[PDB]
């Protein structure tokens, strides 16, 4: 039922994003046959879990999941104890912990809080990874919101061992809410997905994690700029088109003067 899959995907893209989890759970009860497939395509806000061994917050994903268990990135242990599990590797585990430290530093510098989690797995002559960041707006100020970002990177290591190719796909789910005296209540949800490829020289001075972090921060800055400027100023333009602060008589007079100006310009060419 691929047509019904496209139907469900379009409907979920159309519904409000704050109730994405509840409405997705409800929709699963309608056509369960595609539900897991839907869960593979639909992007959901992340969940936080307590790694008690180290005492850390770690993010639950579909890449660290193994059945009905989620692997922590710090303890390297499943929250439900699994007698059999898929650890990444020995070398990729050191890459994972290095990435976890680096992205903890990045999250602290750019977000000042939230939670982060980097999960790596091997790949055909290379390795893939997922970097998850969550950041719930603090309750000190009237602004309350949430930021989720999932960046899946695929690293194809060239045979020479010095060059590699990175393919980054990032999804950002943003939600903001403000209750001010003038605006009363504003609630800006949104989601945005982007992608890009690059190739970089792996070296001791420029290891894998440096390249992945550079790509991730560049994508995060680009997505933040686009969301702030294009995808929010378009909503500003729409709200300005739905109602006019200035009266229409004055607008008509200004437009008549403008018509005079453009015809005069057209005459003199």
């Amino acid at each position: 039922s691929d047509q019904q899959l496209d139907c469900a995907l379009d409907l979920m893209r159309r519904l409000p994003p704050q109730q994405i989890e509840k409405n997705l759970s409800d929709l699963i009860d309608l056509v369960p046959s595609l539900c897991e497939d839907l869960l593979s395509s639909v992007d959901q806000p992340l969940k936080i879990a307590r790694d008690k061994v180290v005492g850390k917050d770690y993010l639950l994903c579909d890449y660290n999941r193994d059945g009905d268990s989620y692997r922590s990135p710090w303890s390297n242990k499943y929250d439900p104890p699994l007698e059999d599990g898929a650890m990444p590797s020995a070398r990729l585990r050191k890459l994972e912990v290095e990435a976890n430290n680096a992205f903890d530093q990045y999250r602290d510098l750019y977000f000042e809080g939230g939670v982060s989690s980097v999960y790596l797995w091997d790949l055909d002559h290379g390795f893939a990874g997922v970097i998850l960041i969550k950041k719930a707006g603090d309750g000190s100020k009237k602004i309350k919101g949430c930021w989720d970002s999932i960046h899946v990177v695929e690293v194809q290591e060239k045979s020479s061992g010095r060059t590699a190719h990175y393919k980054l796909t990032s999804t950002v789910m943003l939600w903001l809410q403000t209750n001010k005296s003038g605006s009363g209540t504003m609630n800006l949800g949104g989601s945005l997905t982007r992608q890009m490829e690059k190739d970089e020289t792996v070296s001791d001075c420029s290891p894998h994690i440096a390249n992945i972090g550079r790509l991730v921060e560049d994508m995060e800055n680009k997505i933040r700029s686009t969301l702030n400027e294009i995808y929010f100023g378009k909503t500003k333009d729409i709200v300005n088109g739905l109602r006019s602060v200035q009266t229409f008589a004055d607008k008509s007079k200004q437009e008549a003067l403008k018509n005079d100006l453009v015809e005069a310009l057209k005459r003199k060419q």
Partner: protein, 46 residues
């Protein structure tokens, strides 16, 4: 009777798809080999 027949047709389709995948793997291997040799000699002269 019809069950074994559909095992036969699905086996034909499966072996055809597996052979196509193995051919794609061979092409990928050849791409890797020629990339190795080319990169080796060109980086050598560089």
């Amino acid at each position: 009777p019809e069950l074994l027949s559909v095992i036969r047709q699905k086996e034909k389709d499966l072996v055809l798809a597996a052979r196509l995948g193995k051919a794609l793997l061979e092409r990928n291997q050849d791409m890797s080999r020629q990339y190795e040799q080319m990169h080796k000699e060109l980086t050598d002269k560089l």
